[PDB]
């Protein structure tokens, strides 16, 4: 069928034929009958695909990133697998291959002839240029990179460049006719091997290629031993020592398809069956991962064992990884712009209201703190993986996801204490907060033991006291993963907007975005949960202790908590009794870890540095708080930080999420999690890799 076939996109007659030989072998196996388009630019292929004129193609990391941009947004469908049948790996190393007997190092590269695989590609041009930057004498505003690189080398075949402006580059490029220095295998020195031919044929003093490149064009040592490698160590090594002598680790070439309505399924099925029948050493007739003698890397990357499935949730950007993304981005930013992104912290605001507060925070801070905004926490977390943000404050249950993704508790919010007026906040330990089940006193029938079939208000799907504790407890009493079945109706923003759990959620004044895991939805979070129990919409509210005192008895001016009588509420203890919120020192469901500031490791030190500055300006004893901007005061709407917070306190050592949340706790989250995985939870599992 038109969409039961996967039209694969070639970029050269030779590549074009390999596919058709594949079409024949894939037919007798009865599967998505592959279709095969032809073109000449690895870019034009991206166009066709994006233009629904093609389906998929395989691009090197660089390309992937490029392909993933707004003009045409493609997605890494499947990663290629490298290594050996027994030691598979999905990333590679960019290496500086040189000849033996050359008394030159990496810092002595000025004015020499170099060979690059292709423009933009990773190992062949990206990484090398990232390494050399310093010795580039680049005026980002006076000229491009191809500019300074041009004067940096005496001549280097760098296919895809425009010799017009920079000819000493394509100068060394083999092949005649303006056809020379092309961006498709059309150009002999273009590619991985093409870059070797370039150092083999005497054209350069060094070629930038992957680790096994040398090994693929020279099977007999005697031959290989005459090629060395350039360590960043400023020393040389044998091509067998790449693991110790390499420029950098980069992600493997993947195969992309369209972002939406992009035949992801038919492609993947088609990739596994091709792998099985013509994988590395499956048939002699046709070799999928091997290309015929003469040319190389046709279609897929030669000598690649298999394909690892990409979670339909990691975009180009997430795929490529954080560090590599950064190296890549910075290749379009001046040394001035990049040093700005480094020194400023970028909080991630969860919602339109919270984004508004950060904008203000930003402003008052003098622009030391800028804002990036997501529609949900899982989204702000994804964002931190993109280095597009820096940190944000997370609740226990959320830290988990963030912790599982590789983030780290930087500073923890500390509330007011009972003992010390001495030890200063930043230095005192967290006493954690209590989880409670609130209900209106005027409901004497309801007890912990009679909660089923009731309506419920939770802070949010996946929050500590709002969900993880309650469903944790209700779960080990039924062994059931079902939640659409314990409460006749409830409001747990986050969950499937069609389940009994989103029935009681209302949303903004206008009625939109019901059950949205951000303040937008009104019965959202610690306060929206209680507002929910207060308004009689549901029967018991699952929230933290102080939450009750914070909206009862004239503490909050929220026109819905104005008249609330504190005693008018009751806690549901676990015995099966109900107590008054005053004696909740013995009627809570459990102790939870304070929400804390997660962030990226490489930013941990910095973020914790800046926040100690901000907090000082607008916190309890701050200097610019009362009058200019109070960081922790949201008018009982708990934005950015818990109102009831006294300060961002430090934490001994470099604790991990498990060390912070709690193994016992962490396990409980894990188990409950077993009932369901997050698309961002799956992504990070693979990501971690
Ligand atoms: Fe590559
Ligand atoms: Fe919480």
Swiss-Prot record:
Principal cellular location given in the protein's record: secreted
Positions annotated to bind hydrogencarbonate 2: 459, 463, 465-466
Keywords: Disulfide bond, Glycoprotein, Hydrolase, Immunity, Ion transport, Iron, Iron transport, Metal-binding, Osteogenesis, Protease, Repeat, Secreted, Serine protease, Signal, Transport
SMART domains (UniProt xref): TR_FER
Record GO terms (molecular function): iron ion binding; serine-type endopeptidase activity
UniProt binding sites for Fe cation 1: 60, 92, 192, 253
GO biological process: antibacterial humoral response; antifungal humoral response; bone morphogenesis; innate immune response in mucosa; iron ion transport; negative regulation of apoptotic process; negative regulation of lipopolysaccharide-mediated signaling pathway; negative regulation of osteoclast development
Subcellular location: Secreted; Cytoplasmic granule
Enzyme class: hydrolase
PROSITE patterns found in the cross-reference section: TRANSFERRIN_LIKE_1, TRANSFERRIN_LIKE_2, TRANSFERRIN_LIKE_3, TRANSFERRIN_LIKE_4
Glycosylation positions in this chain: 233, 281, 476, 545
Pfam families to which the protein is assigned, alphabetical: Transferrin
Disulfide bridges in this chain: 9-45, 19-36, 115-198, 157-173, 160-183, 170-181, 231-245, 348-380, 358-371, 405-684, 425-647, 457-532, 481-675, 491-505, 502-515, 573-587, 625-630
Domain Transferrin-like: 6-333, 345-674
Residues given in the record as hydrogencarbonate 1 binding sites: 117, 121, 123-124
Top-rank taxon, per record: Eukaryota
Active site location: 73, 259
Post-translational modification comment from the UniProt entry: Poly-N-acetyllactosaminic carbohydrate moiety seems to be needed for TLR4 activation.
GO cellular component assignments: early endosome; extracellular space; plasma membrane; recycling endosome; specific granule
Amino acids binding Fe cation 2: 395, 433, 526, 595
Coiled coil regions, renumbered to chain: none
Enzyme Commission (EC) number: 3.4.21.-
Oligomer and partners: Monomer. Found in a complex with LTF, CLU, EPPIN and SEMG1. Found in a complex with MPO and LTF; interacts directly with CP, allows Fe(3+) incorporation into LTF and activation of CP ferroxidase activity.
Family: Belongs to the transferrin family.
Function: Transferrins are iron binding transport proteins which can bind two Fe(3+) ions in association with the binding of an anion, usually bicarbonate. Lactoferricin binds to the bacterial surface and is crucial for the bactericidal functions. Has some antiviral activity against papillomavirus infection. N-terminal region shows strong antifungal activity against C.albicans. Contains two BBXB heparin-binding consensus sequences that appear to form the predominate functional GAG-binding site.
Protein's recorded name: Lactotransferrin
Organism, scientific name: Bubalus bubalis (Domestic water buffalo)
């Amino acid at each position: 069928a038109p969409r039961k076939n996967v039209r694969w996109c070639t970029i050269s007659q030779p590549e074009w034929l390999k596919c058709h030989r594949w079409q024949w072998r894939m037919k007798k196996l009865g599967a998505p009958s592959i279709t095969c388009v032809r073109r000449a630019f690895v870019l034009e292929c991206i166009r066709a695909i994006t233009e629904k004129k093609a389906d998929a193609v395989t691009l090197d990391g660089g390309m992937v990133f490029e392909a993933g941009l707004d003009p045409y947004k493609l997605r890494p469908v499947a990663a290629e697998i490298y290594g050996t049948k027994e030691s598979p790996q999905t990333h590679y190393y960019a290496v500086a291959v040189v000849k033996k007997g050359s008394n030159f190092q990496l810092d002595q590269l000025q004015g020499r002839n170099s060979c690059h695989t292709g423009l933009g590609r990773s190992a062949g041009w990206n990484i090398p240029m990232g390494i050399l930057r310093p010795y580039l004498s680049w005026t980002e505003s006076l000229e491009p990179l191809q500019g300074a690189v041009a004067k940096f080398f005496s001549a280097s075949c760098v296919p895809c460049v425009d010799r017009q402006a920079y000819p000493n580059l394509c100068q060394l490029c083999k092949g005649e006719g303006e056809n020379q220095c092309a961006c498709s295998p059309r150009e002999p020195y273009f590619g991985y091997s093409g870059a070797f031919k370039c150092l083999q044929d005497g054209a350069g003093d060094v070629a930038f290629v992957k680790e096994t490149t040398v090994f693929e064009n020279l099977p007999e040592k005697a031959d290989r031993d005459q090629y060395e490698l350039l360590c960043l160590n400023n020393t040389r090594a044998p091509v067998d020592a790449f693991k110790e002598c390499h420029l950098a680790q980069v992600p493997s070439h993947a195969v992309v398809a369209r972002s939406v309505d992009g035949k992801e399924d038919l492609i993947w099925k088609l990739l596994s069956k091709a792998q099985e029948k013509f994988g590395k050493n499956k048939s002699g007739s046709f070799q999928l991962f091997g290309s015929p003698p003469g040319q190389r890397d046709l279609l897929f990357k030669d000598s690649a064992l298999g394909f690892l499935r990409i979670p339909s949730k990691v975009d180009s950007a997430l795929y490529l990884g954080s560090r590599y993304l950064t190296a890549l981005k910075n290749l379009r930013e001046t040394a001035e712009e990049v040093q700005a992104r480094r020194a400023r912290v970028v909080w991630c605001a969860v919602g339109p209201e919270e984004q508004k507060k950060c904008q203000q925070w930003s402003q008052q801070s003098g622009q030391i703190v800028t804002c990036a905004t997501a529609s949900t926490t899982d989204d702000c977390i994804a964002l931190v993986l993109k280095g597009e943000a820096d940190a944000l404050s997370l609740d226990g249950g959320y830290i988990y996801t963030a912790g599982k993704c590789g983030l780290v508790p930087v500073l923890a919010e500390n509330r007011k204490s009972s003992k010390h007026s001495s030890l200063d906040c930043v230095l005192r330990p967290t006493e954690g907060y209590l989880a409670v089940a609130v209900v209106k006193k005027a409901n004497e029938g309801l007890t912990w033991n009679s909660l089923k079939g009731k309506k419920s208000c939770h802070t949010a799907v996946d929050r500590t006291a709002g969900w993880n504790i309650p469903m944790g407890l209700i779960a080990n009493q039924t062994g059931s993963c079902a939640f659409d079945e314990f409460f006749s109706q409830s409001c747990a923003p986050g969950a499937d907007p069609k389940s009994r759990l989103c029935a009681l959620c209302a949303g903004d004044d206008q009625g939109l975005d019901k059950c949205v895991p951000n303040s937008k939805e009104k019965y959202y979070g610690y306060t929206g949960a209680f507002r929910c129990l207060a308004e009689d919409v549901g029967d018991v509210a699952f929230v933290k202790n102080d939450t009750v005192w914070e909206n009862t008895n004239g503490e909050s001016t929220a026109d819905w908590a104005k008249n609330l009588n504190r005693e008018d509420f009751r806690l549901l203890c676990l015995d099966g009794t109900r107590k008054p919120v005053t004696e909740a020192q013995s009627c809570h469901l459990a102790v939870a870890p304070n929400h804390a500031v997660v962030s990226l490791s490489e930013r941990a030190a910095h973020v914790e540095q800046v926040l100690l500055h901000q907090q000082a300006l607008f916190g309890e004893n701050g200097k610019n708080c009362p009058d200019k901007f109070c960081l922790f005061k949201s008018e009982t709407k708990n934005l950015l930080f818990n109102d009831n917070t006294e300060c961002l306190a430090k934490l001994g050592g470099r604790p991990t999420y498990e060390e912070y949340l709690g193994t016992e706790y962490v396990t409980a989250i894990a188990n409950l999690k077993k009932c369901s995985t997050s698309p961002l939870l799956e992504a990070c599992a693979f990501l971690t890799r």
